[PDB]
Design a protein around this ligand. Structure first.
Ligand SMILES: COc1ccc2cc3[n+](cc2c1OC)CCc1cc2c(cc1-3)OCO2
Lengths: 186, 186
């Protein structure tokens, strides 16, 4: 459990103080742990942070696994997933500590590698919507991996680079894109 | 020069270290300048940054015009614009700096007031490529302004969230996208 308490106190610390700002001395004392132990488990603050990101991503995966019960067809699952990504980012705290981490440990192929292994988990989501949609012939795509990376990064920049518009607008652009994209696949 | 040897050091500094990573002291120091210089020409530091942005947005917008003849129809102009975006040296590079800086000053108003200013220069290249396309007959888009905004960001996502993998796979990815997209329009 001492492992988990470290993960827990860290997530919080990162939300309240940001990334570069949180210190491992803090992490160790607030988790009533030890420097030694922390090294044993994570080796670095960067990996500590990465581990968190896996666990969040694990929750998200799970979160969505239930929210999708209200999407009967895959066309639907595509529109809904794109939206949830847009809406649920507004009020998702970690988001700042991530932006702060990514725009730093970005130039390190070292971290950037573990970073991608993770970026794929968020990409498979689509991978599946497209596969299924295929079997249920909702469309007939055939390089689901390419189309999937395209969708994940398109959606992603709509989410990221539109922060200046008021939410009722962003959610409007996003649904349109889902249509134009989905449209261009048939 | 002096003032043109400052922007010269900021540009690069922002691109390397980050929006934060590079501090006022940094700039001026490696800029061989006085901390006052900044004051009369470059108001604030976020100002020196919001400056290098239009600089970049123009240099690129310009380079685009000089090469956009290679593309005969507007449908070709679409692929090409997106294609070149991946390879330019202008603007796109400090796209990270942007993200960081937007979330680090979004709780102010000189943000939307000037972001949207740079954001209208940005999505403009598509405005014309789509507008003309209507005139040209290559397609019919009623919401051009909308579509421009959407396209510009999906594309900025692809250019940005893929900077690490083989430069040629990007051009491939980007082109299957430009296709899926133009397809959804007609
Ligand atoms: C409401 O809760 C949310 C909402 C949204 C979340 C979004 C993401 N994660 C947790 C979330 C979460 O965790 C609880 C972790 C992994 C991830 C990788 C990404 C991405 C978004 C996310 O964009 C592209 O790469």
């Amino acid at each position: 459990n001492l492992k988990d308490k470290i993960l827990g106190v860290a997530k919080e610390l990162f939300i309240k103080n940001g990334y570069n700002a949180t210190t491992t001395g803090e992490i160790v004392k607030l988790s009533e742990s030890s420097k030694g132990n922390l090294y044993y488990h994570f080796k670095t603050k960067e990996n500590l942070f990465l581990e968190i990101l896996n666990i969040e991503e694990s929750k998200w995966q799970e979160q969505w696994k239930k929210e999708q019960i209200k999407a009967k067809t895959n066309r639907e699952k595509f529109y809904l997933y794109n939206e949830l990504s847009l809406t649920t980012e507004y009020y998702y705290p970690l988001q700042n500590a991530i932006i702060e981490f990514y725009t730093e440990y970005y130039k390190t192929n070292s971290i950037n590698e573990k970073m991608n292994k993770l970026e794929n988990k968020y990409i498979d989501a689509y991978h599946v919507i497209f596969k299924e949609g295929n079997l249920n012939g909702e469309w007939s795509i055939n390089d689901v991996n390419a189309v999937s990376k395209i969708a994940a990064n398109a959606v992603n920049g709509i989410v990221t680079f539109t922060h200046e518009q008021n939410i009722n607008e962003r959610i409007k652009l996003m649904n349109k894109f889902s249509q134009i994209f989905l449209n261009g696949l048939s």
